[PDB]
Write a structure and sequence with these properties.
Elements lengths: L2 E7 L7 E7 L4 E8 L5 E3 L24 E11 L5 E13 L2 E14 L1 H4 L6 E4 L16 H5 L7 E5 L6 E5 L12 E4 L8 E9 L5 E9 L6 E3 L1 H8 L6 E3 L4 E5 L7 E5 L2 E5 L5 E4 L6 E4 L1 E3 L6 E3 L1 H4 L3 E5 L5 E5 L2
Parallel strand pairs: 3-8, 4-7, 13-22, 14-21
Antiparallel strand pairs: 1-2, 1-10, 2-3, 2-6, 4-8, 5-6, 6-7, 9-10, 9-23, 11-24, 12-13, 12-17, 14-22, 15-16, 16-20, 17-18, 19-20, 23-24
Length: about 325
């Protein structure tokens, strides 16, 4: 089997991407944030504290004839950005782009943190990291991909995120028309539960490539590109007037600037992030100070190849017995 679904930016800045997901019988379609950095499929629901729901579409398990309460199961998650959610668990039928899993754990939120409430466009998350990170207790549950894998034509999914435009998540096949040149594959460590890999280096603008190993995670659920302070300083030094602002929370730059590209290495291959992908717009409405899309990972504890990086590539998440990652230009 295969599946193919369009993923759409939630706003004009590509702060996140939402993908429609069918849950239950009859289908209840929710728009979920596909997150290769976590491993829970959780939704706003009829059980979510009413004051914490503000415009989201909810899953109502009592209206699904295939929903079954997973007795005694609870979940609770905290994300890198400080947001969180928790609740109980159903199993139900879940379909993405024509690909159907029966008996998928659907984690129903009883509580969500304010950042989720305040984002009306995201109805929940669909985790695509390794199932070892799943938070369901006392019996850990499998991701949608893990459940689908054996049925797929090939045990892969691909992320093709758009810049200021829709893109595609495919399951079970590689669309050879969706990229240019070849796909370069690179080793993955699953030791921390992530799609963790080592970039071979970087360049800023038309500058020379610096060969250096950068361990980090391919994370569709993180907006920005978080890299070591040395690398980030080298980038922003090429933007006149750019500075790190402790009050704002990262590097800012004059909105009048033209940003240089940023290149990262995948083996001997190179992925070029155009400068415009690194512009996250005014820090507050009407400001002429703009927020940068490349930020320091210092104090995160890990480097993160988030959407800024991934959207410059066609990305293969190869879930073979030994997983790997592939990157192509597009």
């Amino acid at each position: 089997s295969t599946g193919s679904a369009t993923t759409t930016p939630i706003d004009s800045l590509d702060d996140a991407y939402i993908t429609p997901v069918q849950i239950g019988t009859p289908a209840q379609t929710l728009n979920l944030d596909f997150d290769t950095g976590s491993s829970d499929l959780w939704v706003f629901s009829s059980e979510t504290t009413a004051s914490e729901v503000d415009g989201q579409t909810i899953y109502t398990p009592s209206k699904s004839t295939t929903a079954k309460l997973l007795s005694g199961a609870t979940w609770s998650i905290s994300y890198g950005d400080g947001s969180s959610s928790s609740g109980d668990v159903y199993t139900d039928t879940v379909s993405v782009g024509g690909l159907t899993v029966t008996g998928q754990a659907v984690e129903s939120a009883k509580k969500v943190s304010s950042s989720f409430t305040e984002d009306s466009t995201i109805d929940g998350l669909l985790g695509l990291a390794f199932s070892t990170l799943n938070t369901v207790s006392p019996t850990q549950q499998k991701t949608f991909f893990d459940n689908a894998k054996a049925s797929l034509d090939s045990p892969v999914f691909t992320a093709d995120l758009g810049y200021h435009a829709p893109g595609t998540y495919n399951f079970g096949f590689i669309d050879t028309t969706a990229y240019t040149g070849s796909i370069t594959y690179t080793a993955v460590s699953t030791k921390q539960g992530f799609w963790e890999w080592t970039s071979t280096g970087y360049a800023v603008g038309s500058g020379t490539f610096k060969s250096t190993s950068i361990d980090g995670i391919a994370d569709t659920g993180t907006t920005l590109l978080y890299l070591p302070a040395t690398v980030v300083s080298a980038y922003w030094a090429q933007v006149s007037g750019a500075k790190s602002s402790s009050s704002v929370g990262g590097y800012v730059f004059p909105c009048s600037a033209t940003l240089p590209s940023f290149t990262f290495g995948v083996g001997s291959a190179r992925i070029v992030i155009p400068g415009d992908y690194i512009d996250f717009g005014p820090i507050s409405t009407g400001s002429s100070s703009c927020f940068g899309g490349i930020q320091s990972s210092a104090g995160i504890g890990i480097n993160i190849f988030g959407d800024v990086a991934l959207k410059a590539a066609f990305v293969v998440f190869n879930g073979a017995t030994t997983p790997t990652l592939g990157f192509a230009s597009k």
